[PDB]
């Protein structure tokens, strides 16, 4: 990736032996043509990281809402239902799996193991038998609450304030989904690019006749500006894509796996 | 697409430029980049903002269907939690959903619905349905009618029929939003004034340029042309989120994935 | 509109540069394009963020009216899927949701809404709706009255009775939001700097733009002057949405819609 | 306002710069505009940015008090819906009501509201709420009160309790909202940025334009200086949105309009 | 510290100045022309970040007031609903102050062993200290004083609904806070953006040098400020928790919220 950096610094050094054999031909390029261009792609860059980083922003708070929902979840069957541990467990089970399987939902990844780690095959062949794993666990983490209020443990309202939360799983399910079979722009969030790479391979042979040799350092630095601002562009439009980020959704697991376990004393340790 | 249309008559007007830069002085007509570059700039601003409206707005629909999605996987989710015996009721209020999102599909789409209807739903609801000038609506209003009839039954206390009706409002605001998105579009005077000016900048700019660039116009008034040509575009695509397009929603394959989903959670 | 006039106008200044060019020469005036180059990117900046705060007002505007249609919506099919038998409370309920739509309309359009309550209702709370300072908000608890002439000796339960209740309340904070963007609009610094320095800026630029564009002058100003005027003035009605322009809401066929839908 | 008391200065500026033009190369000082129109630009973004913030939390403000206007219409005509035979309710309430709306307007003025207070209640209250440091607050709290008897007299089941409640939570919200925006102020910094960027670049502006525009420089500063000092003075009053300035909120007319609605939703 | 490289960049041009004849010499010239166009470049991205910026300090600012918020409705539907239960208004009050203590202790990366031990007993300091997430078990525990309060009797499950709302309510705002706290604005912004302002800066009076002459140092200086400070206001609203200057000040916003609590139970300080 600094490979057309270096690329077309050799522009820059093609340029100058080309500005030399010139005006023999029409050829001429001045700075003001280029500098409207440039400011207009700029402006578009502007506004299209901006999008990009309002998606980005959008799925942090997703995950986000992961972690709060199963925390406010967890904390109200701790205090509402204190001695039902076994049922604890297993929606606490159901809601770590939620977790993994939905990050291995956005990131195409197997969550089979993730599931065998922490769910009864029976239940994990279910869910990996359906095309739709995560919703699956949310409707059987449901069952669990629903059990709990067929045997008169919960009531209606307090159902309905656990059944709240698992909406919130829900949008944010959702959401991700939605963030995921996204970008909207059909593959032209790739024209511009190469309208960014033509314009800073072209740049140079417009820059030559005013700085000459001091030429490949200008347009390297203009293009590093550019072309590094419209990857972070492309890279904020998929948070959740092949070539994405471990950390943000591998530390988010890890965390709100860590924190249920933390609220349920099956930590820490004896 | 079209934008090859651009592109050539840029061309060729680059090329009229190029033959006719000699009869300048004798009309008294020279021209400057200068005033151009200000033009060009207050134009790539407005259209960066006007994009920012379409695209604002497109994402809005995809999040509306979005809505959809989640909004029925929790209200059949709820049916099996709270009822888990009553499949019929749970297979009733399915049919309704789906029926629900197609129809909505259909209506964003303006196609008959009465074919998946009745695919989905008995007759005799069916003629409820379009006999209603808002069939979408009704349909809300039939499955409302199911959750109702399963509170009068007992079934459902006042709470639990609360929690689903809250999924019918979720519902509600989307068809609302649709429908309003269906509707009033971004003013297009914006569109308007915006096409307007950037035609007549991009066939302008070859004679924007002409002087300064001779022999390699067509490649730069091109380059900047479809510069703004291609990012002019992206309302054309931005702006039919419920068109047949290939860039639009794929409404279709939505609906099928919610019919799915909620044939999915119902053991069928 | 009259645009045109101040294109035409920015065309006579054109000419006028054109005619007295190089009588700057005689006169010690030396205009460049570069300063003004300056000045119209600020303007146009300037321009695109303000009319980006207009389009947000009219946006929001457009969706207070359509959660309008939204809550009404869902309120009347509450009341069937609750109280199915009830009609009576239906058909009262119903007209007053569609007199608290056009109430509100005529209410941000300044205009009387008395006809059309009448249409819509009994004269005697028609009365007691002109009657109030607020008559939309009087409408608002005209419709909890019928809600809580339900729930008072049965029919409807606390519960539902909420259910119902969060429907007016979607109402009132639609109320509120449409009042909040009518009574305070803009602050009239708005156009109150842009409108000379727009067109301040668009009838000198002509005087330095004849320096460089000579003969072919005028077409390039008005070019200018259309965008900057063309763009100013998309501010003129997305900033008003209530306003009875072109580009703003109309709100008359949102009513229409609503009732519509209400009386299906 | 005194912004025509920095256009004077940018004139004498402008005459000093075109009498000791040519003392500048005489003195080995050079100035074209190029970047001055870079320098000009990038102030210009910075402006339309922070103008931008401005803007926003004046409008945010804005629906703060749209939002107590609206709660307290909602609450007042739950009370009338709910218990239309409690009139003590309704009036006690309403006065603690439209007490709230003029202790949060005092309170942002940084005015003393007791007088207000005693006109809309009784004084041993009055005292009670002005011995607390966060009046506003211990207002809310009162109208809980008086919701908490109504529950505890078996009037308000748990859940009407809850319909009020709720409403209590929307004016708490804006209490907390308005007093993060008096409290939190702005990020100065933008205005000690904006300030003397701006003003330097429009005294510095006409020694940079001299060259080219000669006699014409304090007119075409002057104008620029216009627009730039325009435009930061038209931020000045929308980061304050509380303040008592001509182009701020009517807090007064808002907080009468309160009184007006609720009384007239009561029957006075 | 900007004052330091405003110094280097004057010396900078005092270099450009003093000396350089040396491109002419050499063959290498620059002019601002290509220096304008990235200079409004950089000034556009520099436009977005720092609105993104502030952005993020506004969303912290509404946090922390929704935490005031909260507990203040916390507090008062507990003497509305249960005003004879004046020592578990005591009890779940020095939780919400506790939990205000601990998530600012929590976002400055310190210890609020100190904080915690000043108004909770030694028992459930220790039971909290030992949490992943101390706040978290603080909420668990008003929580647990609330559920307890439903158990017995003194609350229905509708009103023991009405206040697990607003520890819902601050669950999203510790969520949100944590959610600032770990996602830093990425580096590859800065990376590029800073360095690419500096080295703007440091180059650009080599190229305003050929048409400004002597004035150079005092252009370039002054497009360095500005450039640089408006970066660095950006830099200084990304780090809403830090104690730099442009900064929360959490220590007043949370004794503001203990006091706030502590006139709503009738105690004084
Ligand atoms: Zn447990
Ligand atoms: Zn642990
Ligand atoms: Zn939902
Ligand atoms: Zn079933
Ligand atoms: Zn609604
Ligand atoms: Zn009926
Ligand atoms: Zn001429
Ligand atoms: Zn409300
Ligand atoms: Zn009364
Ligand atoms: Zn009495
Ligand atoms: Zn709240
Ligand atoms: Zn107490
Ligand atoms: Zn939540």
């Not at 799925?59 to 929902?69: D, P, Q, S």
């Not at 993730?114 to 794993?133: C, G, K, Q, W």
Request: net charge negative; aromatic share 10%; hydrophobic share 45%.
């Amino acid at each position: 990736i600094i490979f057309r950096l270096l690329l077309n610094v050799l522009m820059s050094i093609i340029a100058i032996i080309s500005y030399q054999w010139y005006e023999q031909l029409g050829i001429h390029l001045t700075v003001a043509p280029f500098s409207l261009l440039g400011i207009a792609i700029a402006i578009f860059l502007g506004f299209r990281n901006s999008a990009s980083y309002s998606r980005f922003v959008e799925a942090r708070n997703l995950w986000g809402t992961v972690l709060i929902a199963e925390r406010t979840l967890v904390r109200q069957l701790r205090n509402i239902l204190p001695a039902e541990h076994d049922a604890h467990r297993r929606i606490v089970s159901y809601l770590v799996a939620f977790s993994w399987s939905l990050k291995h939902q956005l990131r195409k990844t197997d969550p089979t193991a993730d599931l065998r780690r922490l769910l009864p095959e029976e239940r994990v062949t279910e869910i990996l038998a359906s095309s739709m794993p995560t919703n699956r666990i949310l409707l059987l983490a449901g069952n669990e609450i629903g059990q709990l209020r067929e045997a008169g443990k919960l009531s209606d309202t307090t159902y309905g304030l656990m059944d709240n939360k698992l909406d919130e799983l829900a949008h944010v399910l959702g959401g991700c989904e939605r963030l995921a079979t996204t970008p909207v722009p059909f593959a032209y969030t790739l024209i511009l690019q190469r309208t960014v790479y033509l314009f800073c391979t072209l740049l140079p042979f417009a820059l030559v006749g005013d700085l000459h040799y001091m030429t490949p350092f200008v347009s390297v630095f203009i293009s590093y500006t550019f072309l590094s601002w419209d990857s972070l562009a492309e890279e904020l439009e998929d948070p959740f894509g092949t070539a994405a980020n471990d950390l943000p959704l591998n530390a988010m697991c890890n965390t709100i796996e860590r924190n249920l376990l933390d609220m349920t004393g099956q930590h820490p340790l004896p």
